[PDB]
Design a protein around this ligand. Sequence first.
Ligand SMILES: *[C@@H]1O[C@H](CO)[C@@H](O[C@@H]2O[C@H](CO)[C@@H](O[C@@H]3O[C@H](CO)[C@@H](O)[C@H](O[C@H]4O[C@H](CO)[C@@H](O)[C@H](O)[C@@H]4O)[C@@H]3O)[C@H](O)[C@H]2NC(C)=O)[C@H](O)[C@H]1NC(C)=O
Ligand SMILES: *[C@@H]1O[C@H](CO)[C@@H](O[C@@H]2O[C@H](CO)[C@@H](O[C@@H]3O[C@H](CO)[C@@H](O)[C@H](O[C@H]4O[C@H](CO)[C@@H](O)[C@H](O)[C@@H]4O)[C@@H]3O)[C@H](O)[C@H]2NC(C)=O)[C@H](O)[C@H]1NC(C)=O
Ligand code: 28Z
Ligand code: 28Z
Ligand SMILES: *[C@@H]1O[C@H](CO)[C@@H](O[C@@H]2O[C@H](CO)[C@@H](O)[C@H](O)[C@H]2NC(C)=O)[C@H](O)[C@H]1NC(C)=O
Ligand SMILES: *[C@@H]1O[C@H](CO)[C@@H](O[C@@H]2O[C@H](CO)[C@@H](O)[C@H](O)[C@H]2NC(C)=O)[C@H](O)[C@H]1NC(C)=O
Ligand SMILES: *[C@@H]1O[C@H](CO)[C@@H](O[C@@H]2O[C@H](CO)[C@@H](O)[C@H](O)[C@H]2NC(C)=O)[C@H](O)[C@H]1NC(C)=O
Ligand SMILES: *[C@@H]1O[C@H](CO)[C@@H](O[C@@H]2O[C@H](CO)[C@@H](O)[C@H](O)[C@H]2NC(C)=O)[C@H](O)[C@H]1NC(C)=O
Ligand SMILES: *[C@@H]1O[C@H](CO)[C@@H](O[C@@H]2O[C@H](CO)[C@@H](O)[C@H](O)[C@H]2NC(C)=O)[C@H](O)[C@H]1NC(C)=O
Ligand SMILES: *[C@@H]1O[C@H](CO)[C@@H](O[C@@H]2O[C@H](CO)[C@@H](O)[C@H](O)[C@H]2NC(C)=O)[C@H](O)[C@H]1NC(C)=O
Ligand code: NAG
Ligand code: NAG
Ligand code: NAG
Ligand code: NAG
Ligand code: NAG
Ligand code: NAG
Ligand code: CA
Ligand code: CA
Ligand code: CL
Ligand code: CL
Ligand code: ZN
Ligand code: ZN
Ligand code: ZN
Ligand code: ZN
Lengths: 693, 693
Amino acid sequence: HNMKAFLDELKAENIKKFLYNFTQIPHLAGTEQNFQLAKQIQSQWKEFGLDSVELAHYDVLLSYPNKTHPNYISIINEDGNEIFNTSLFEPPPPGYENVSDIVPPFSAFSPQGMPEGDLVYVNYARTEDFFKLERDMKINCSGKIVIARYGKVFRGNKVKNAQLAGAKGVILYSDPADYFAPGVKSYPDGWNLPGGGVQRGNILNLNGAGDPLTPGYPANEYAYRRGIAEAVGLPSIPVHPIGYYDAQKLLEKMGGSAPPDSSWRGSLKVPYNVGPGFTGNFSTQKVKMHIHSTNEVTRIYNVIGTLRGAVEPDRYVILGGHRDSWVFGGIDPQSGAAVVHEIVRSFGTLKKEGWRPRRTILFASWDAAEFGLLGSTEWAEENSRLLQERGVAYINADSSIEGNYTLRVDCTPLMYSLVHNLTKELKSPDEGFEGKSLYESWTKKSPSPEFSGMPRISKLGSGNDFEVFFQRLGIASGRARYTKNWETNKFSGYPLYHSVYETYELVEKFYDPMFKYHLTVAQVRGGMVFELANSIVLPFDCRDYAVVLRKYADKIYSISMKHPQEMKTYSVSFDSLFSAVKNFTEIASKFSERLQDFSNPIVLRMMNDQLMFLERAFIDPLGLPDRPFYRHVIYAPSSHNKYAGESFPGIYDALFDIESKVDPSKAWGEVKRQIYVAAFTVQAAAETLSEVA
Amino acid sequence: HNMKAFLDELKAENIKKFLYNFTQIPHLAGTEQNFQLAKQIQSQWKEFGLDSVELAHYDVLLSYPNKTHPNYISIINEDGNEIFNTSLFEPPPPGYENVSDIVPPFSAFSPQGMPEGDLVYVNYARTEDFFKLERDMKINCSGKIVIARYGKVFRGNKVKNAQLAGAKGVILYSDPADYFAPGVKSYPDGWNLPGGGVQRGNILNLNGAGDPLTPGYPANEYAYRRGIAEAVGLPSIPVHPIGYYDAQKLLEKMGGSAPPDSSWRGSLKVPYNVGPGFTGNFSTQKVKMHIHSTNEVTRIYNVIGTLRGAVEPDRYVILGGHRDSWVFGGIDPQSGAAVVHEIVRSFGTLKKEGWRPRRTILFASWDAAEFGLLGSTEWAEENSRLLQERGVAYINADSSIEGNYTLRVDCTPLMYSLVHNLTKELKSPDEGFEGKSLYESWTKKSPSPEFSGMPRISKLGSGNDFEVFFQRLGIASGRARYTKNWETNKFSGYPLYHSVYETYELVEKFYDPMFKYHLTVAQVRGGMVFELANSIVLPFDCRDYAVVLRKYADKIYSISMKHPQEMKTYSVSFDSLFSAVKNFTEIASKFSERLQDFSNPIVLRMMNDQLMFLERAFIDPLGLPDRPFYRHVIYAPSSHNKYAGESFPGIYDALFDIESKVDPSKAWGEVKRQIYVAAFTVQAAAETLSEVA
Ligand SMILES: *[C@@H]1O[C@H](CO)[C@@H](O[C@@H]2O[C@H](CO)[C@@H](O[C@@H]3O[C@H](CO)[C@@H](O)[C@H](O[C@H]4O[C@H](CO)[C@@H](O)[C@H](O)[C@@H]4O)[C@@H]3O)[C@H](O)[C@H]2NC(C)=O)[C@H](O)[C@H]1NC(C)=O
Ligand SMILES: *[C@@H]1O[C@H](CO)[C@@H](O[C@@H]2O[C@H](CO)[C@@H](O[C@@H]3O[C@H](CO)[C@@H](O)[C@H](O[C@H]4O[C@H](CO)[C@@H](O)[C@H](O)[C@@H]4O)[C@@H]3O)[C@H](O)[C@H]2NC(C)=O)[C@H](O)[C@H]1NC(C)=O
Ligand SMILES: Nc1nc2ncc(CNc3ccc(C(=O)N[C@@H](CCC(=O)N[C@@H](CCC(=O)O)C(=O)O)C(=O)O)cc3)nc2c(=O)[nH]1
Ligand SMILES: Nc1nc2ncc(CNc3ccc(C(=O)N[C@@H](CCC(=O)N[C@@H](CCC(=O)O)C(=O)O)C(=O)O)cc3)nc2c(=O)[nH]1
Ligand SMILES: *[C@@H]1O[C@H](CO)[C@@H](O[C@@H]2O[C@H](CO)[C@@H](O)[C@H](O)[C@H]2NC(C)=O)[C@H](O)[C@H]1NC(C)=O
Ligand SMILES: *[C@@H]1O[C@H](CO)[C@@H](O[C@@H]2O[C@H](CO)[C@@H](O)[C@H](O)[C@H]2NC(C)=O)[C@H](O)[C@H]1NC(C)=O
Ligand SMILES: *[C@@H]1O[C@H](CO)[C@@H](O[C@@H]2O[C@H](CO)[C@@H](O)[C@H](O)[C@H]2NC(C)=O)[C@H](O)[C@H]1NC(C)=O
Ligand SMILES: *[C@@H]1O[C@H](CO)[C@@H](O[C@@H]2O[C@H](CO)[C@@H](O)[C@H](O)[C@H]2NC(C)=O)[C@H](O)[C@H]1NC(C)=O
Ligand SMILES: *[C@@H]1O[C@H](CO)[C@@H](O[C@@H]2O[C@H](CO)[C@@H](O)[C@H](O)[C@H]2NC(C)=O)[C@H](O)[C@H]1NC(C)=O
Ligand SMILES: *[C@@H]1O[C@H](CO)[C@@H](O[C@@H]2O[C@H](CO)[C@@H](O)[C@H](O)[C@H]2NC(C)=O)[C@H](O)[C@H]1NC(C)=O
Ligand SMILES: *[C@@H]1O[C@H](CO)[C@@H](O)[C@H](O)[C@H]1NC(C)=O
Ligand SMILES: *[C@@H]1O[C@H](CO)[C@@H](O)[C@H](O)[C@H]1NC(C)=O
Ligand SMILES: *[C@@H]1O[C@H](CO)[C@@H](O)[C@H](O)[C@H]1NC(C)=O
Ligand SMILES: *[C@@H]1O[C@H](CO)[C@@H](O)[C@H](O)[C@H]1NC(C)=O
Ligand SMILES: *[C@@H]1O[C@H](CO)[C@@H](O)[C@H](O)[C@H]1NC(C)=O
Ligand SMILES: *[C@@H]1O[C@H](CO)[C@@H](O)[C@H](O)[C@H]1NC(C)=O
Ligand SMILES: [Ca+2]
Ligand SMILES: [Ca+2]
Ligand SMILES: [Cl-]
Ligand SMILES: [Cl-]
Ligand SMILES: [Zn+2]
Ligand SMILES: [Zn+2]
Ligand SMILES: [Zn+2]
Ligand SMILES: [Zn+2]
């Protein structure tokens, strides 16, 4: 019973069977079908051999369309006649045209409204897109309906940006530029998005809060709930998503200003005029939204499985991923959930033969991730004290594949060495790399920008269920999946994301017919869990944090140095931060020497506790400015794009667009404050690795 | 080498020698004399045998009078002639009339000003005193100078209360009712306060923040400081303290309304009229303050001594107390510091013979406690991650004696059993109890109100250096001293508190000539430290927390039940809190069974970690409303009196004066919210004692 036994037990055919089983009907959060799937998973995890498997339920704010009053958008003439209406549903794929309970496309948590007005096209609705409109083009979005293409940033940030620009509504659409790869056919013939396809997704700005009504505390049976007016993260203006057939109709009549440059033009046969409003002949026509969705407190269910550790049962290694889907969840999340299911099965086979991991492994099937990471966050709020003092690591397990090209890993620097070592042990599934390691194929296909002979590993961003564990609680986190070639494919994500077309057949026909990429991902996620739960010394290398901290310090200093006059005027010095990073580097090096130079289980566990609490040391209990649930001082989700990670976020946000601030003395004062907080936190984290007494 | 060896090594004569040594000159925070004492203590602790002894320095906001522009109060006539002036200094005691650098009486952190106006007498300036004035007597304090007697509550709360009433200045004075015990002579002939004596003390409202300029972060060399206008806790109106000779002069001419009842009358031969202003003949005279004190960022020095643990060096038991004094510090703090010095000496004697404690013991000589617990708080801010994950317990060590009658202990319920057991082992020093235990004499003199045959142990309040450890960080804390008979003595504290008269001679002549009460206190504080640092299983009994939680729940429910109509209207239920307390009781009972029923050092340490993190579990990382550094959900300093502890403070403050709130729906909503937070926290703490997996 070693890692090889665990790995060898994983089977592609099992992952295939589980994926098929999980994707025959929709599993929307808060629905009966998703409760039944939770009960099935609970039963199977018990069968598979886990020590305990429970459901943890919460009552959280969810959002659904009104089944008898559908959402749609119109072009309306001056008489009030609706002369064009957007679709009421996506044409269902072959053999699913009789499937019931497919939720039609909608933006979850949109308020109700029927706003009428003139359109302004805002490109991707990024911060810089709105800068270009108001500052350079002098276009006023106030009282306008904005139309934005999906892509580049999280859609909740688009909506926040549109609100702040004074928009009265937002229309989101999928442009073929961003969702249709040249030379591939539309579903069901290929993996591209058809013109009737639409991307569902929530538009909250929760900043880590979890259920909008219960920030800080689990939404249990006696929870006190905020009123809707005080809820966290809800949009103030109606929002609705459409496909590119419907978008073309809305965009084709657009007048006003030309697009400012080619980066504003998608691939539709329209001019991409910014507006406001339509060209001369249609100038009296307007666009009207009709949104009737309702927010409702609804029960959700996480499944929590425990495999008790033999030696350190009070140390938890957690493998978690969500179960709820927008429709069938063929990739998101069931390609991930099928992998977790097979990993549980494999650990359980070893357990039945008398083996136990050194540390406790917790397995989680989270609910309501699509509605704002609600299930993972409520459970972590409930269990924060246990997780704070006992949580070794969290490995996420959403979608296993978004392409068939190479591995994609995002994780804390503490797991870099673990990932390098594990992938050197695993077989590459790639064509042309038979008999070579996964490390070799991954490194060849995705080279590190910094280091020759090393693969790319990214920072954690957000938009997935590791957020509460990593940026709120400070537990070392990672994730891994298979991805496309991010060089020859300028579309980002996979085209059928959050559409009805994301099915079992999509995966089996077009992504991974042999389930070998799924198997490789199971080996990586499972292998990481195995090493974290079984290695005598925790498999974290603090020296890797020292390297990245210096990179991040150089980066933030370089941003500040675009303003040398102000740094002179306000005596803005990064000396303290570089000093702290130098100290961290020195102390980490000495700790590493002791770790290899120390029979003594107290010294071991003392050292294991130092390793475990190192990620924890980057937590500031006061949080980042106006984002109390983003507490990690090194990493936070970008304030402009929840999906992307930002390093030294407190300093970064203090410097962002600083030349536009009215009171530079105050603005640079806050930069200095954030430098002090970051330097202090880095030094304090370093000192947790010093000799204890 | 056992506890008896440690205890036997402590000597009364050594404590006496150290007290004499520490009290010959003033040791005001931020002065050269106090830096030299820090260096002396550092040297001696090294000599005594500690493994390391360092100074930890910070630059914090302090406050001092202007040496060339003294503070005083006048009665001024209508021409502007100052016809009476308060004293510029306390008459120095015999043999100290040539001691230099005695700081004259002042209220630390008072702003500057020369406000003139009519006096209003506000009794003790408590919340209920101001309720009586504005609500019942219809007296408006707006634009008035208020005069308040010291006593009952922390003087910072008096000042906050006066500010909120619209006062333009505050005069604090010591009334013989509260500071002159009948039948005892004034210093130097007895231990009473003479009419020229004055109580110094800060008037901040920091709510746990530490240095006013750096809340959250240590005031190190690169710290970013708030501007004075954004500083935490500073008073907005000038304040100055006086003795009762000067008070009588200010009060004797008072007119307006009679005092409302006898509880408003002190012992001076004046009517105790409330005012405003003086009686007819003197109606045109006014009172004028002259305050010229300055706030200045000043270096302070903590001494930190380490005695490395033999088995668990990464577990810290901390004995700390302050070193800075207002003048000579004969009782406060040097009676405590001399005890710590002898405890260090004794542990060091054992260490020189080859002994080490199981766990690390840290010893601390804190600076600037008199200015707001600044030294302990800055050091805990610096070291919060180490303390959070490694801090077993904190034992405070301020004044060892305030009387000669019996023991006084305040501590977490987790230490009740430890204190009972230890005091049963120790000899009573009391006359009439020769050959009996300290437990016996203490229990006889200070019986528990709840339980026959048990001594009184109080909740921790605040006003001392355990605050950051206990209410911010959630580390189990306690304190012990000798006290007066709190039945036959209606004066509270000791009369010479914070006066120039608090000297070595005061202690040696009047309080403890044989230093036997000091020795008993050294045995209690030292014995607690010894058991915490050496016992195989941490000496905490979680079942004692369960008992008190039920008492506190009954108490808060009874407060709410004074409003049955509102509890019906707003569906205010305490069911969740009682459920959580019942669950805590059940789980704690089961944990206790396992603790006694479990050779295995991992199970032991797992269980020791459960014991250590139990106090930690009562911490809410969001803090209490508007008091982010009071994070403990069971205990906080009273919002009306920093010295007193309040239980379930969040619910208590939500219920306080609720019948006066304009929007009862909102007010009772907040009561329910606080019930939810408290029930959740109690359940979450209980669950940390459940089986870990
Ligand atoms: C990284 O680690 C290093 C230790 O290897 C650590 O060095 C520390 O730096 C501080 C800040 O420089 C030093 O602080 C000094 O301490 C002495 C007493 O030991 C004081 O006298 C100094 O103050 C005087 O000088 C100041 C500067 O001109 C004046 O502003 C001040 O008014 C005084 O005149 C000063 O406080 C400290 O001694 C070292 N500690 C060591 C070497 O052990 C460094 O701080 C770490 N980096 C970070 C970001 O923490
Ligand atoms: C103290 O410990 C006890 C456990 O010994 C713990 O008991 C738990 O109480 C909660 C709240 O009552 C129970 O929650 C129920 O769970 C079931 C499923 O197991 C649900 O079906 C229930 O919901 C239905 O009924 C509700 C009440 O009428 C409705 O409001 C709701 O809409 C549903 O109809 C309900 O959620 C839970 O099962 C037990 N757990 C046990 C017994 O293990 C108690 O909560 C603890 N106290 C505190 C303060 O935590
Ligand atoms: N090989 C490769 N490299 C990349 N590098 C950079 C980028 C930049 N763009 C993105 C980066 C990350 C994401 C992302 O992490 N998306 C999430 C989306 C999961 C999700 O649907 N979450 C819900 C809930 C989110 C929430 O409420 O927080 C939602 O977004 O609707 C994920 O895949 O984990 C999206 C865009 N994309 C890629 C890429 O596609 N491939
Ligand atoms: N046997 C006995 N029982 C009592 N029970 C209840 C009370 C109620 N009144 C008080 C309770 C506690 C205190 C108190 O704890 N005072 C502090 C004062 C220490 C001090 O001077 N601290 C500074 C700084 C405080 C700060 O900034 O927070 C100050 O108050 O000026 C202490 O002795 O620990 C004061 C009044 N008093 C007594 C009592 O005197 N004796
Ligand atoms: C997914 O697989 C599960 C597990 O095999 C299937 O649930 C079982 O169905 C059989 C036949 O109806 C029952 O006898 C068992 O009690 C079920 N086991 C459970 C729920 O643990 C389920 O039918 C499959 N779903 C699909 C869509 O194929
Ligand atoms: C777009 O949809 C609307 C709503 O169903 C259609 O307008 C309705 O048409 C019916 C029948 O002509 C009328 O009785 C309703 O009063 C109309 N409702 C509204 C809100 O106008 C409209 O015909 C559709 N337009 C197109 C081009 O299909
Ligand atoms: C990744 O693999 C490397 C190579 O085996 C590990 O580094 C070795 O660790 C052993 C045991 O401490 C040392 O004796 C060697 O000197 C190390 N070799 C090096 C640094 O080149 C490394 O520890 C592994 N990383 C993890 C997280 O397990
Ligand atoms: C308090 O005691 C200390 C320790 O004995 C005295 O400081 C010593 O003074 C002698 C004689 O001046 C020196 O030789 C030593 O170097 C000092 N030792 C130290 C500072 O550790 C100090 O004089 C005493 N203070 C008073 C007021 O009596
Ligand atoms: C109270 O103190 C003040 C300040 O010292 C005294 O008033 C001063 O008296 C001198 C000499 O007569 C004058 O030159 C100053 O102009 C006065 N200053 C002020 C502010 O009035 C006053 O005499 C003292 N009163 C008593 C009764 O001692
Ligand atoms: C205080 O002393 C009591 C009495 O010795 C301790 O309680 C005993 O503990 C032992 C060892 O676990 C048990 O065998 C006995 O049954 C206990 N006696 C009782 C409960 O009456 C108690 O543990 C001590 N408290 C502390 C904190 O050490
Ligand atoms: C949905 O719309 C229907 C019919 O137009 C209405 O009767 C019902 O109240 C709505 N349901 C909601 C708001 O949940
Ligand atoms: C945009 O439009 C509205 C008028 O409808 C106006 O109140 C607002 O100030 C305008 N903003 C700018 C920047 O022109
Ligand atoms: C799978 O790989 C092949 C060969 O590189 C490629 O042509 C195809 O686009 C890939 N399929 C998907 C869904 O990425
Ligand atoms: C104190 O008062 C003197 C003389 O009245 C003045 O010159 C000096 O500025 C003051 N010192 C301060 C404010 O620190
Ligand atoms: C108290 O006095 C001032 C007038 O000097 C007034 O503004 C204030 O409203 C008064 N308050 C009450 C409660 O009478
Ligand atoms: C010491 O005890 C005696 C006898 O009870 C008492 O008369 C005296 O007041 C005490 N001294 C002090 C300072 O409390
Ligand atoms: Ca919540
Ligand atoms: Ca501070
Ligand atoms: Cl993932
Ligand atoms: Cl004390
Ligand atoms: Zn997903
Ligand atoms: Zn998704
Ligand atoms: Zn003190
Ligand atoms: Zn004091």
